[PDB]
Amino acid sequence: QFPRQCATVEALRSGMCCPDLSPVSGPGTDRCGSSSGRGRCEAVTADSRPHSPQYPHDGRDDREVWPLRFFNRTCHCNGNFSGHNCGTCRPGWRGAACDQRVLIVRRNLLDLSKEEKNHFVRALDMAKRTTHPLFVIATRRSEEILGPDGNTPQFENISIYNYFVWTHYYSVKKTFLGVGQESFGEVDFSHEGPAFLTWHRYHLLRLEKDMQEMLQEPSFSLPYWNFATGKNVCDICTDDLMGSRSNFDSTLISPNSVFSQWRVVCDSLEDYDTLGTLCNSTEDGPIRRNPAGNVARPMVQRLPEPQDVAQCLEVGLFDTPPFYSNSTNSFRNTVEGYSDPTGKYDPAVRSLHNLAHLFLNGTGGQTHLSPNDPIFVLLHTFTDAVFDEWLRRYNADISTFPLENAPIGHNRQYNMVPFWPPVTNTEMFVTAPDNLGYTYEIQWPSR
């Protein structure tokens, strides 16, 4: 989850992740672009406030108070600069002085031209195969991060797209259970709590930026899938888009799609939970997808109705106690899909976002794997657009987003795990057009 240049013995020893930008006088000369005034190496701010109760709780999880288990100093950027070394710009700005406004437009995948559809599928396929230029991932927990001989960092290179899968995995995986140790209650830093929407928004912003850099196309934008159609089919499961069903195995993707060649990451839960390792960059096994084919669970065999979206946008409180999968009259819990579209909780219901995932009946609907299916991108940009419209309706009213006692990872000033550099739920809780450099071309149902 860290810049390559800080995944070292010295950097972990110093507790500093403050890489050079333009070090002309030898190493360590231009930390955070300080020599041009772009930023400075400073102490990190991490959320101190208490999280909702956990039984048991020994507090040894590396994700608590992220990222202080690893680094306590980072680059704090000035003005409109940003990035791990202050070498780029805040979203909505570009140029060497980061003084030129930019606005990109996220569009319905089906409204794209034939040529733009092909461009998008080629870009995703390239992200799947190209090494992330900046980040490396840990294969081991903190206490074993330097290897058996105490001098070998257990980090691996990873593709742009696989890094997107890994960060989601790391946010949901179980805290490691030794011998004789009673099983902990489950935690989730990115679902089942108010950080659901701010977490997934940043996730997307980072993938978009990585792909813009990979293509050298500053204007590249992620499109969205309008899943609120009521349909009994996936209307983007064609061989020019996300891939139709294989005629040889109805849970596989058509071999006339590039996505039939993708192999998934993070699918060895049993090894992670027994050996106490983390997901590494080795791929293993194809995407499984089978839209509408969950015969056991019939409620999951049709997609959300258009009016499900108009209804959830009436729910006027962002979230409500106890800030969890059983909140009621919570906009967040409604869009996430644990409560019906009017606001009303009910443990049997699956709506909106959760329904879209479960409809896929495969890789796309297991929480540790789901981003391995690229439909995840398009389902999350749609979910984000609903979030953005709610932010516009209700003047970005953050007041019900709890400062304390939310499930771990979900307090308002938590650094969303495991993103780098540190970034709070607060920073994503803004209207995108004016604050984050992007808008959606979309029409809402008028009820």
Ligand X SMILES: *[C@@H]1O[C@H](CO[C@@H]2O[C@@H](C)[C@@H](O)[C@@H](O)[C@@H]2O)[C@@H](O[C@@H]2O[C@H](CO)[C@@H](O[C@@H]3O[C@H](CO[C@H]4O[C@H](CO)[C@@H](O)[C@H](O)[C@@H]4O)[C@@H](O)[C@H](O[C@H]4O[C@H](CO)[C@@H](O)[C@H](O)[C@@H]4O)[C@@H]3O)[C@H](O)[C@H]2NC(C)=O)[C@H](O)[C@H]1NC(C)=O
Ligand Y SMILES: *[C@@H]1O[C@H](CO)[C@@H](O[C@@H]2O[C@H](CO)[C@@H](O[C@@H]3O[C@H](CO[C@H]4O[C@H](CO)[C@@H](O)[C@H](O)[C@@H]4O)[C@@H](O)[C@H](O)[C@@H]3O)[C@H](O)[C@H]2NC(C)=O)[C@H](O)[C@H]1NC(C)=O
Ligand Z SMILES: *[C@@H]1O[C@H](CO[C@@H]2O[C@@H](C)[C@@H](O)[C@@H](O)[C@@H]2O)[C@@H](O[C@@H]2O[C@H](CO)[C@@H](O)[C@H](O)[C@H]2NC(C)=O)[C@H](O)[C@H]1NC(C)=O
Ligand U SMILES: *[C@@H]1O[C@H](CO)[C@@H](O[C@@H]2O[C@H](CO)[C@@H](O[C@@H]3O[C@H](CO)[C@@H](O)[C@H](O)[C@@H]3O)[C@H](O)[C@H]2NC(C)=O)[C@H](O)[C@H]1NC(C)=O
Binding residues for Zn(2+): 168, 191, 200, 353, 357, 380
Q: Which helix (H) or strand (E) holds 419?
A: none
**Cα–Cα distance, 389 to 391 (Å, whole number):** 5
Cβ proximity of 311 and 319 under 8 Å: no
Determine, following the binding rule CB under 6 A, whether residue 56 of this chain makes contact with ligand Z.
Answer: no
Binding-site residues, in ranges, read 168, 191, 200, 353, 357, 380
CB nearest Zn ion: which residue? 230
**Cα–Cα distance, 316 to 283 (Å, whole number):** 43
Q: Which helix (H) or strand (E) holds 356?
A: helix 352-359
- For ligand Z, the binding residue among 28, 133, 147, 316 (CB under 6 A) is 133
Determine, following the binding rule CB under 6 A, whether residue 14 of this chain makes contact with ligand X.
Answer: yes
**Dihedral (CA of 33, 4, 437, 435) sign:** negative
Q: Which stretch binds Zn ion (CB under 5 A): 41-49, 138-146, 211-219, 283-291?
A: 211-219
Q: Cβ-count burial of 361 within 10 angstroms (0-12 exposed, 13-18 middle, 19+ buried)?
A: buried
- In terms of Cα–Cα distance, which of 21, 172, 10, 15 is closest to 85? 21
Determine, following the binding rule CB under 6 A, whether residue 72 of this chain makes contact with ligand X.
Answer: yes
- Closest separation between CB of residue 73 and ligand X, Å? 7
**Cα–Cα distance, 409 to 378 (Å, whole number):** 24
Of ligand Z, Zn ion, ligand Y, none, which one does residue 407 interact with (CB within 5 to 8 Å by kind)? ligand Z
- Closest separation between CB of residue 333 and ligand U, Å? 34
Amino acid at 382: F
Determine, following the binding rule CB under 6 A, whether residue 268 of this chain makes contact with ligand U.
Answer: yes
- Closest separation between CB of residue 442 and ligand Z, Å? 33
Q: Which residues inside 320-379 make contact with ligand Y, applying CB under 6 A? A: 361-362, 365-366
Distance from first CA to last CA of the chain, Å, rounded? 44
**Cα–Cα distance, 374 to 419 (Å, whole number):** 20
Q: Which stretch binds ligand Z (CB under 6 A): 64-72, 222-230, 266-274, 321-329?
A: 321-329
- Closest separation between CB of residue 282 and ligand U, Å? 5
Q: Which is nearer to ligand X, 278 or 360 (CB)?
A: 278
- For ligand U, the binding residue among 139, 244, 351, 415 (CB under 6 A) is 139
**Cα–Cα distance, 278 to 143 (Å, whole number):** 12
Name residues whose C-beta falls within 8 Å of residue 188's C-beta, 6 or more positions apart in sequence: 171, 172, 367, 407, 409
* Alpha-helix runs per DSSP H in 113-155: 114-129
Determine, following the binding rule CB under 6 A, whether residue 14 of this chain makes contact with ligand Z.
Answer: no
Determine, following the binding rule CB under 6 A, whether residue 271 of this chain makes contact with ligand U.
Answer: yes
Nearest-Å Rg of the Cα atoms of the chain is 21
Q: Which is nearer to ligand Y, 229 or 294 (CB)?
A: 294
Q: Which is nearer to ligand U, 32 or 136 (CB)?
A: 136
Determine, following the binding rule CB under 6 A, whether residue 280 of this chain makes contact with ligand U.
Answer: yes
Other C-beta atoms within 10 Å of 337: how many? 23
Q: Which stretch binds ligand X (CB under 6 A): 8-16, 130-138, 224-232, 272-280?
A: 8-16
Q: Which helix (H) or strand (E) holds 274?
A: helix 269-275
- Closest separation between CB of residue 369 and ligand Y, Å? 9
Binding site for ligand X (CB under 6 A): 13-15, 68, 70-72
Binding site for ligand Y (CB under 6 A): 293-296, 361-362, 365-366
Binding site for ligand U (CB under 6 A): 139, 268, 271, 277, 280, 282, 284
